Amino acid sequence: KLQDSLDAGVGNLVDADLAKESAKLQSLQTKQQLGVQALSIANQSSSSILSLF
């Protein structure tokens, strides 16, 4: 009984909750795709100066 309790306790200490990581993972994949499109949008700055000359 004691060994079972100790194993359960250690798991209680250092186990994750995968349901939260799934949501966070989805949000982060969307956010990274968005940050890439945002960076690509920001990159094309200063490209308009050529038209001035």
Next chain:
Amino acid sequence: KLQDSLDAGVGNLVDADLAKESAKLQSLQTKQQLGVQALSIANQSSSSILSLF
């Protein structure tokens, strides 16, 4: 006779009715599968923002 009565009484106090737990267990397994599908549906929110840019 008295010892038999005392055992029966203690059982009356602290015994379960397994027929109710069976029904509750079935309902809870269905409800958990449903809550998982619901969570998975809710997770995919905010995934549409990418199409805007």
